[PDB]
Amino acid sequence: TQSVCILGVTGSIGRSTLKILGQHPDKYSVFAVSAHSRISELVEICKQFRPKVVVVPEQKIAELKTLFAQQNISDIDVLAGQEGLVDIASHTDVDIVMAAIVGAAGLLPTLAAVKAGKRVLLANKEALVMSGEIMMQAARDHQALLLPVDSEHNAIFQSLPHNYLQADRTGQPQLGVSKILLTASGGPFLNHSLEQLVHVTPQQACKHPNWSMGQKISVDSATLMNKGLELIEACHLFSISEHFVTVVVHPQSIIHSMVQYVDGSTLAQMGNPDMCTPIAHALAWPERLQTNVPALDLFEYSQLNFQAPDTQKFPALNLARQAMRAGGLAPTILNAANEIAVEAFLMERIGFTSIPQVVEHTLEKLENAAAESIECILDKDKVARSVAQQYISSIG
Amino acid sequence: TQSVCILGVTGSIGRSTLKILGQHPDKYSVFAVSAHSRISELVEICKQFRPKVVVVPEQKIAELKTLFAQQNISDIDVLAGQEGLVDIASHTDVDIVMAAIVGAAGLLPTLAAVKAGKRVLLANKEALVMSGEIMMQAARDHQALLLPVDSEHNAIFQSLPHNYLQADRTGQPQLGVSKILLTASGGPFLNHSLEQLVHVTPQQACKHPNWSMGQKISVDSATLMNKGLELIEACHLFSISEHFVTVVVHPQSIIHSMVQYVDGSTLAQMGNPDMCTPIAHALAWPERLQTNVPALDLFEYSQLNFQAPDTQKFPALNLARQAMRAGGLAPTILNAANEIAVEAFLMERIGFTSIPQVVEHTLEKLENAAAESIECILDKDKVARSVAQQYISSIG
Numbered sequence: 001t002q003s004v005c006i007l008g009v010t011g012s013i014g015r016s017t018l019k020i021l022g023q024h025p026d027k028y029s030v031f032a033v034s035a036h037s038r039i040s041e042l043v044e045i046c047k048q049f050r051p052k053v054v055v056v057p058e059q060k061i062a063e064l065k066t067l068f069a070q071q072n073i074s075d076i077d078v079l080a081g082q083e084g085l086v087d088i089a090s091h092t093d094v095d096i097v098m099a100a101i102v103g104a105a106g107l108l109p110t111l112a113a114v115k116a117g118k119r120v121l122l123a124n125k126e127a128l129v130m131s132g133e134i135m136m137q138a139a140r141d142h143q144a145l146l147l148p149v150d151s152e153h154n155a156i157f158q159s160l161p162h163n164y165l166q167a168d169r170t171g172q173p174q175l176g177v178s179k180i181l182l183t184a185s186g187g188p189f190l191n192h193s194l195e196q197l198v199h200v201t202p203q204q205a206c207k208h209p210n211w212s213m214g215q216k217i218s219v220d221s222a223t224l225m226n227k228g229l230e231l232i233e234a235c236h237l238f239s240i241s242e243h244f245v246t247v248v249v250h251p252q253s254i255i256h257s258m259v260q261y262v263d264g265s266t267l268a269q270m271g272n273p274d275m276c277t278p279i280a281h282a283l284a285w286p287e288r289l290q291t292n293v294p295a296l297d298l299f300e301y302s303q304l305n306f307q308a309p310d311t312q313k314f315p316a317l318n319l320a321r322q323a324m325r326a327g328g329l330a331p332t333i334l335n336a337a338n339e340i341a342v343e344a345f346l347m348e349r350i351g352f353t354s355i356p357q358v359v360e361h362t363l364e365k366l367e368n369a370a371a372e373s374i375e376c377i378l379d380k381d382k383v384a385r386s387v388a389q390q391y392i393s394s395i396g
Numbered sequence: 397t398q399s400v401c402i403l404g405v406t407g408s409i410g411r412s413t414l415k416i417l418g419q420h421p422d423k424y425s426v427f428a429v430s431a432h433s434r435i436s437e438l439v440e441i442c443k444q445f446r447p448k449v450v451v452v453p454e455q456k457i458a459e460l461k462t463l464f465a466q467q468n469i470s471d472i473d474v475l476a477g478q479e480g481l482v483d484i485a486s487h488t489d490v491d492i493v494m495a496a497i498v499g500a501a502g503l504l505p506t507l508a509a510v511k512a513g514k515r516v517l518l519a520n521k522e523a524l525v526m527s528g529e530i531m532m533q534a535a536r537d538h539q540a541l542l543l544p545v546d547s548e549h550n551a552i553f554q555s556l557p558h559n560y561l562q563a564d565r566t567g568q569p570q571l572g573v574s575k576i577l578l579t580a581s582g583g584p585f586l587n588h589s590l591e592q593l594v595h596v597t598p599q600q601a602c603k604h605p606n607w608s609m610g611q612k613i614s615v616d617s618a619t620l621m622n623k624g625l626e627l628i629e630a631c632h633l634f635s636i637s638e639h640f641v642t643v644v645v646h647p648q649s650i651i652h653s654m655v656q657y658v659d660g661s662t663l664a665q666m667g668n669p670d671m672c673t674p675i676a677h678a679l680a681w682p683e684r685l686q687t688n689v690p691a692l693d694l695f696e697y698s699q700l701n702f703q704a705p706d707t708q709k710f711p712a713l714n715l716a717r718q719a720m721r722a723g724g725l726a727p728t729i730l731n732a733a734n735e736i737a738v739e740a741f742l743m744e745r746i747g748f749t750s751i752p753q754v755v756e757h758t759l760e761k762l763e764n765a766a767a768e769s770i771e772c773i774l775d776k777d778k779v780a781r782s783v784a785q786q787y788i789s790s791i792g
């Protein structure tokens with residue numbers, strides 16, 4: 001029986017993780033948990049799973065303790081902030097860490113888990129997009145089991161030769177691999193015209209037709225910046241250069257991604273769209289874990305389609321590939337700019353079409369440099385956020 | 397550099413094997429080869445690949461030597477019959493045996509290769525359908541590397557957990573597997589009406605829309621007895637009971653077959669329809685072998701469809717499942733009946749619709765018994781051939 005620390009338990013990924021862990025209390029206990037604003041959901045979670053430690057930002061500690069007071073919930077240690085996130089992500093008594101915080105805020109805890117040699121289920125893709133080879137080299141230097149939860153990357157992991165982890169990291173495919181096809185749903189506005197793209201509303205962006213998710217990844221999916229981020233993520237996780245990864249639009253989102261081989265083989269992972277599958281896989285790897293996700297029924301889902309992405313209508317993809325080829329702090333700049341642009345759009349301060357625009361501007365305005373350390377990364381991230389906020393405010 | 401004995405080199409599989417081996421003369425040399433009627437094609441093959449030994453039936457030896465005389469081809473040992481087939485399939489100097497003979501005639505050589513502990517590339521599916529657990533137990537008892545060449549079974553092999561070979565053979569899936577989906581093109585007459593089914597001609601049966609193959613497997617594909625045989629084959633190769641294998645019609649024949657997992661995962665192998673891919677895989681496993689098969693392009697092959705087989709319109713499928721559940725000598729009876737029924741149809745002695753009919757009759761007429769030995773199997777095969785020939789002759 002292994003202990004789990006869930007970072008961002010109240011979110012979409014956190015809740016799918018809770019489902020799986022609740023089906024297997026004999027294999028997994030919950031030791032630590034973190035939330036950022038959904039405090040009463042967190043209290044109910046605490047009742048059901050009785051963690052030893054919980055974390056919230058400082059400006060919520062009070063509101064949480066008062067709640068714990070009502071339910072007469074005692075015995076739960078309460079820590080605050082990024083510092084509590086790191087402490088629980090690298091805790092002596094934790095065995096597995098689900099990194100399900102959203103965006104850059106998850107970088108320090110996640111990396112911490114990596115440096116403590118935990119089994120790290122990487123859902124927070126932004127952390128890897130920011131830290132790249134630092135996080136990967138740290139996983140290797142501390143024997144951290146860094147397993148992908150992002151559905152495409154889990155699909156690729158499952159479609160690679162089984163010991164691909166221990167292969168020569170050279171940027172070049174290995175062991176017969178020749179290409180990776182990174183599937184994409186194309187977002188809810190795949191077939192929208194530029195006219196309606198210009199006037200998309202937040203509610204529309206957030207309603208994904210296949211996956212029920214948080215707002216940030218919903219928008220990124222509508223915008224195809226999610227797929228840009230996932231291209232960067234795949235390049236780091238599997239240590240491959242970007243021009244070996246090909247994006248494929250697949251509206252049904254039943255095939256999750258593909259690996260192609262030098263003998264003409266293409267291996268795939270597919271299934272009903274339910275993050276519980278890849279969560280269970282990463283959690284139990286190398287063992288398979290029973291879940292309640294129904295078996296894929298191809299008589300009901302009897303058609304699958306594919307097509308090339310429209311990188312003129314969704315320029316975020318070429319921006320991400322850009323950052324990747326540039327390397328260094330380019331993915332960090334991109335990620336920070338996109339974070340505050342998505343934020344500004346969700347707050348109806350900017351139009352949908354403007355989201356990539358601010359990203360591009362930031363990337364053209366702020367200059368790149370080597371990703372030498374986490375300090376440098378956080379620094380460049382702050383500066384990119386500033387540049388992007390300024391550009392925004394100058395367009396209304 | 398390893399030596400290869402190709403059984404049935406002149407056929408479709410034999411020629412794809414020749415393509416691959418010709419691209420890699422530094423890794424593979426051809427030591428032995430066999431043909432049954434295409435003698436001058438065989439002589440040209442001998443020129444190009446210079447085997448040490450060739451085999452043909454006795455009633456062709458003369459015709460071959462005369463040919464060798466013309467070209468002044470010497471140094472090639474000539475053996476005759478099933479006995480020469482066994483001798484070359486188990487030869488001290490052979491390392492790999494491609495079992496690409498068609499039908500029951502390939503049983504003794506193939507099994508021989510298995511008993512000599514060679515790496516056996518199993519294309520001749522009839523041999524396994526006949527001999528089942530005898531052949532599998534012999535592969536295990538002699539450490540024969542028995543690798544599937546049949547495209548669906550190669551796809552499944554690639555989609556299983558990687559050490560599935562060493563798992564507990566119990567008829568029950570293992571290591572998280574929950575189902576196998578055995579894809580089927582549905583044949584050229586998938587959407588034909590019973591009226592036109594009744595008057596299908598041999599030329600029509602033989603023209604497969606995806607794969608260029610021999611006549612027997614072409615007919616079996618039109619008839620869906622190929623898929624019956626492949627259900628039996630899968631059950632033996634992966635040691636699973638039949639009710640875990642689900643047939644899926646997939647007209648584009650781009651997905652080759654699938655394995656489903658208890659976490660909701662489905663793993664797949666897909667690619668352009670070219671037997672060179674699975675041949676190369678089985679030949680080089682566990683290493684990947686470069687081939688000239690073009691990479692699968694999902695922008696060109698941009699649609700995939702699936703549907704349930706019509707086992708009322710193609711009753712050969714339920715007949716095969718029948719034989720499998722019955723066990724013992726039931727697959728042998730089925731296979732022999734189908735062999736001479738397909739033969740009679742190709743010789744315009746019977747109508748297409750009659751093919752399964754004779755099979756069924758034979759299975760109802762001849763009684764089952766345990767598959768105790770190869771002797772018993774050959775015996776029951778002869779008796780089934782006799783029963784089927786009699787039934788045929790009694791319908792014109």
Ligand SMILES: NC(=O)C1=CN([C@@H]2O[C@H](COP(=O)(O)OP(=O)(O)OC[C@H]3O[C@@H](n4cnc5c(N)ncnc54)[C@H](OP(=O)(O)O)[C@@H]3O)[C@@H](O)[C@H]2O)C=CC1
Pocket residue numbers: 007008009010011012013014034035036037038039099100101102103105123124125126149150151211212213214215216217275
């Ligand atoms: N949801 C999905 O299906 C998929 C998501 N992912 C990745 O998983 C990560 C989270 O996904 P998702 O569940 O959709 O997002 P959510 O918004 O639903 O959840 C985010 C979680 O992080 C916490 N959080 C939010 N902001 C902060 C902050 N400054 N500091 C600390 N914690 C914070 C939230 O707490 P609270 O709820 O209390 O505000 C919440 O627990 C993301 O990186 C996403 O890209 C990957 C592929 C699939």
Ligand SMILES: NC(=O)C1=CN([C@@H]2O[C@H](COP(=O)(O)OP(=O)(O)OC[C@H]3O[C@@H](n4cnc5c(N)ncnc54)[C@H](OP(=O)(O)O)[C@@H]3O)[C@@H](O)[C@H]2O)C=CC1
Pocket residue numbers: 403404405406407408409410430431432433434435495496497498499501519520521522545546547607608609610611612613671
């Ligand atoms: N072709 C394909 O794409 C696929 C075929 N397979 C399997 O591979 C096997 C052969 O396939 P295929 O190439 O299509 O069939 P073919 O008819 O094209 O070739 C059969 C081979 O076996 C030889 N042969 C035929 N009859 C006899 C006999 N009594 N005794 C000894 N040898 C004989 C042929 O010699 P000759 O040419 O001189 O007459 C020929 O070399 C079959 O079991 C088939 O089911 C599996 C899946 C794909």
Ligand SMILES: CC(=O)N(O)CCCP(=O)(O)O
Pocket residue numbers: 149150151152183184185186187211213217220221222226227275
């Ligand atoms: C399930 C998953 O892994 N996602 O990243 C959700 C978005 C899928 P897409 O970006 O719309 O293809």
Ligand SMILES: CC(=O)N(O)CCCP(=O)(O)O
Pocket residue numbers: 545546547548579580581582583607609613616617618622623671
């Ligand atoms: C390529 C292969 O493995 N075959 O058995 C050919 C027939 C394919 P189907 O039986 O028509 O699906």
Ligand SMILES: [Mg+2]
Pocket residue numbers: 150151152153230
């Ligand atoms: Mg994803």
Ligand SMILES: [Mg+2]
Pocket residue numbers: 546547548549626
């Ligand atoms: Mg086949």
